[PDB]
Design an enzyme around this catalytic site. Structure first.
Site, PDB file in Angstrom:
ATOM      1  N   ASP A  20       0.842  -1.176   0.000  1.00 41.42           N
ATOM      2  CA  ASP A  20       0.000   0.000   0.000  1.00 41.42           C
ATOM      3  C   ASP A  20       0.885   1.236   0.000  1.00 41.42           C
ATOM      4  OD1 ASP A  20      -2.839   1.318   0.720  1.00 41.42           O
ATOM      5  OD2 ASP A  20      -1.312   2.292   1.947  1.00 41.42           O
ATOM      6  N   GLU A  22       0.811   5.662   0.326  1.00 39.28           N
ATOM      7  CA  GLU A  22       0.085   6.904   0.529  1.00 39.28           C
ATOM      8  C   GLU A  22       0.778   7.976  -0.290  1.00 39.28           C
ATOM      9  OE1 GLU A  22      -2.273   4.641   2.691  1.00 39.28           O
ATOM     10  OE2 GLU A  22      -2.740   6.706   2.109  1.00 39.28           O
ATOM     11  N   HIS A 178      -5.788   6.047   7.475  1.00 38.42           N
ATOM     12  CA  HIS A 178      -5.024   5.338   6.455  1.00 38.42           C
ATOM     13  C   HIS A 178      -3.521   5.420   6.699  1.00 38.42           C
ATOM     14  CE1 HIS A 178      -8.634   5.759   3.697  1.00 38.42           C
ATOM     15  NE2 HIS A 178      -8.880   6.618   4.671  1.00 38.42           N
ATOM     16  N   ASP A 183      -3.450  -0.360   6.392  1.00 38.26           N
ATOM     17  CA  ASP A 183      -4.099  -0.771   5.153  1.00 38.26           C
ATOM     18  C   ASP A 183      -3.367  -1.951   4.528  1.00 38.26           C
ATOM     19  OD1 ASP A 183      -5.968   1.233   5.556  1.00 38.26           O
ATOM     20  OD2 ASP A 183      -5.266   2.488   3.926  1.00 38.26           O
TER      21      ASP A 183
HETATM   22 MG   LIG Z   1      -4.485   4.033   2.466  1.00 36.87          MG
HETATM   23 MG   LIG Z   2      -4.527   2.101  -0.839  1.00 35.39          MG
END
Ligand SMILES: [Mg+2]
Ligand SMILES: [Mg+2]
Ligand SMILES: [Mg+2]
Ligand SMILES: [Mg+2]
Lengths: 212, 211
Positions: A20, A22, A178, A183
């Site tokens: 993941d 950001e 998040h 995540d």
């Molecule tokens: Mg995220």
């Molecule tokens: Mg994502």
DNA sequence: TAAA
């Protein structure tokens, strides 16, 4: 002893790594990568998939990178926070790539495949950054991914990450979204659950006739 | 169709199988040369199957690049008189129209592209839709159903020909790379994966899994 | 390593 597990046999030699990222916006080519987490997977004695190694890096925006305020408002990241411990795209990806290559060799795979939720998003940001920092021997497949949105759509009838996880019987906490870490960890557990459920129900291994 | 389970299966997403052929790998710079689309439906027993097929040969947009290696690969001659090529707008407008009808008729809310390594086809379809300034694009702007990932899960295979053969389907090297044939095999593959999960009892879910 |  990874060589001895079925990990390398399950996805024709692809070594699944959950990712993941950001970011400071939606455009992989112009918007900053701000954070990345990666979780390699392993297969236990009974042939169940589970998380193996976790890596987590805060990333310094690349030279010239844009930063959209709406993105920062969404992920709650402040690029100028002292406690960020931000490193360069190069060091973050170099460390991730090293561990992934090690896992690939140890498991008897031949390359890595990114597992991600709406995987084209993370794959593009990760590829753009690898391009920027001129990393070579990128162990990830240049175009193929394992999108957990599509997989959850099949297995659970849900494409939204939070809903898919809940439907799978996992906890999902809106507060903890998040962090890249949270995540990634929820996405890894979701993906493992989908694969394990398929095995549970007898969908894998295939029957004899299905040998071609 | 609103009385079938189609709209309940994927949270209101209306699955449409797509394959494009192109004069290169860059959706932004390389010509879109061909596209086929296959909508799906559920029969009364809840099995997924192909519904409507559309197939268009596409005129390269103004300034489009044409890589020879791509032409060699897909066998397409952009100047063949038999191409019956139409503009990106005509092709996508017709595809979009039929998809919007299907959505409304089935009670869905949005379409989702089913494709093999779907980011590829999704990027070209989106790029083309942008160039032609098509409006009310019924496709999800970023979500896809990638049959490579799905086949990886269901069949342990990510290569289209191999996935299909594993699933017990015919796959012919000679027919490959017509958009029609690739789309048709991809639709049959996707339906088989969904249907298999149902056969094995993976769907519908149990009561506990209701949130 | 197979989406052209
Ligand atoms: Mg995220
Ligand atoms: Mg994502
Ligand atoms: Mg294709
Ligand atoms: Mg093709």
């Amino acid at each position: 002893n990874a060589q001895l597990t079925g990990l390398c046999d399950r996805f024709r030699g692809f070594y699944p790594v959950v990712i993941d990222v950001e970011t400071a916006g939606f455009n992989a080519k112009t918007d900053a990568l701000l954070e990345i987490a990666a979780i390699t997977l392993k297969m236990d004695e009974q042939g169940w998939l589970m998380p193996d190694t976790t890596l987590h890096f805060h990333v310094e925006p690349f030279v010239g990178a844009n930063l959209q305020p709406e993105a920062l408002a969404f992920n709650g990241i402040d690029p100028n926070d002292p406690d960020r411990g931000a490193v360069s795209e190069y060091e973050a990806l170099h460390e991730i790539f090293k561990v992934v290559r090690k896992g690939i060799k140890a498991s008897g795979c031949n390359r890595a495949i990114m597992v991600a939720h709406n995987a084209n998003f993370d794959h593009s940001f990760m590829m753009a950054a690898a391009e920027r920092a001129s990393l070579k021997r990128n162990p990830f497949h240049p175009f193929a991914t394992f999108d957990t949105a599509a997989l959850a759509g099949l297995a659970l009838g849900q494409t939204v990450l939070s809903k898919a996880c809940q439907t799978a019987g996992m906890d999902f906490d809106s507060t903890q979204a998040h962090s890249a870490l949270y995540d990634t960890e929820r996405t890894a557990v979701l993906f493992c659950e989908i694969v394990n459920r398929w095995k549970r129900l007898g969908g894998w291994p295939l029957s004899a006739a299905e040998e071609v």
